[PDB]
Structure 1
Amino acid sequence: PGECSVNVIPKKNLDKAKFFSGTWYETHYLDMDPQATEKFCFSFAPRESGGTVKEALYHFNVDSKVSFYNTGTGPLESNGAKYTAKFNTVDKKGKEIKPADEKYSYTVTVIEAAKQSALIHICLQEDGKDIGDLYSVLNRNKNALPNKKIKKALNKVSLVLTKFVVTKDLDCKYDDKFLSSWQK
């Protein structure tokens, strides 16, 4: 199965204005498929208004030296820390170059946030069925280590940080202006 993890708990009372602002950098990630070993850098700029999330996504494939740009949009759950989005493909100037494929979606759960750190989980789906998932440690600073509360949250779901890929050890290239200028 490409079954998504159980026991993924949304943070209680996430500060929305703080989390859904600025740019987040992935510092550590754990793809739950052990054979998924392509190296990636990830950053994004999530925004929220009227119960709808609109986020700009940036990935960089370290192996192939190719970047790609996406935007995602979807309703925020009443718990305020989980959303399911559909995504399109845009160029670096933000113009759509491929429309959203209706059969795909992803569900982001914000498990924990503390200081400059966060822990999220993403369940990818096709036609509403699980096709894979990943845990991501985020920071406002690319080079920073996570707050201990992020580790505490990992421990509750029987994960340890040492299992994660460390992003700062990769030769990343970022488009920071794409994210900085999001919804400007």
Structure 2
Amino acid sequence: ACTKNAIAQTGFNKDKYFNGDVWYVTDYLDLEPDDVPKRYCAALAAGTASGKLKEALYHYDPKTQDTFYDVSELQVESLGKYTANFKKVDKNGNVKVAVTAGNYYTFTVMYADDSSALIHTCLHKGNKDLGDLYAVLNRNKDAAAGDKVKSAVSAATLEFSKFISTKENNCAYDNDSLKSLLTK
């Protein structure tokens, strides 16, 4: 279960974050791991599409090859804090699993600038017991975490040394499908 009320970034710039571009997860911290995808690739696009606030998600497990995309319309709770009901889609946006109540994630932007970000998410998916997940994002899939975002990890009272890197998984992403999915 989740246990954190993540604090959104003071003066969070929503139009800059939600500009329709892609963010890559470079490092993550799951507060309830198992034994676990210690190996994992993830990326998202975030933008406004025809006046609606949207995110498109991509997950890939580089060992099992388990692959899935999601699209969500985000609802605002407060600045930098959202509730997202998701639908699993193929890369082209055709629905595989429809939106349903009980399938949602919260999303908090704790820190962001033009190249990097720190987010918290709490996933809810039917029957599952899932925990808090923090992710360090960058606009460049290969970028080592900078002092700006590492300071934010500290300020959130976390230790960046506990985060797991995704960079040794040689992830490759379809940026084009992530951007396109924002409209779907």
Pick the TM interval, shorter chain.
Answer: 0.7 to 0.9
Q: Is the 8 A contact 1:123 1:132 kept in 2?
A: yes
The aligned amino acid for 1:69 is: Y
User: Which residue does the alignment assign to 2:10?
Assistant: 12
Q: Structure 1 segments of 4 or more deviating over 3 A? A: 48-52
Describe how 1:37-116 pairs up with structure 2 within 5 A.
Answer: 37-38=36-37, 39-48=39-48, 52-79=52-79, 81-116=80-115
Q: Is the 8 A contact 2:40 2:61 kept in 1?
A: yes
Tell me the TM-score normalized by structure 2. 0.87
Q: Are the structure 2 counterparts of residues 130 and 77 from structure 1 closer, same or farther at C-alpha, using a change threshold of 3 Å?
A: farther
* Whole-angstrom CA distance in 1 between matches of 2:50 and 2:89: 24
- Kindly, what percent of the aligned residue pairs are identical? 39
* Whole-angstrom CA distance in 2 between matches of 1:78 and 1:51: 18
The aligned amino acid for 1:71 is: V
Structure 1 unpaired stretches of 5+: none
* Whole-angstrom CA distance in 2 between matches of 1:130 and 1:37: 14
* Whole-angstrom CA distance in 1 between matches of 2:35 and 2:71: 23
* Whole-angstrom CA distance in 1 between matches of 2:72 and 2:105: 9
Q: Are the structure 2 counterparts of residues 117 and 91 from structure 1 closer, same or farther at C-alpha, using a change threshold of 3 Å?
A: same
2:36 is paired with a residue whose SS is coil
* CA RMSD, Structure 1 to Structure 2 (Å): 2.2
Q: Is the 8 A contact 2:56 2:182 kept in 1?
A: no
Q: Is the 8 A contact 2:91 2:181 kept in 1?
A: no
How far does the alpha carbon of each residue in 1:120-167 deviate from its partner, in whole angstroms, 9 at most, with x for none?
00012357x973110000000011122312112211232121211111
2:67 is paired with a residue whose SS is strand
* Whole-angstrom CA distance in 2 between matches of 1:135 and 1:36: 18
Structure 2 unpaired stretches of 5+: none
Tell me the TM-score normalized by structure 1. 0.87
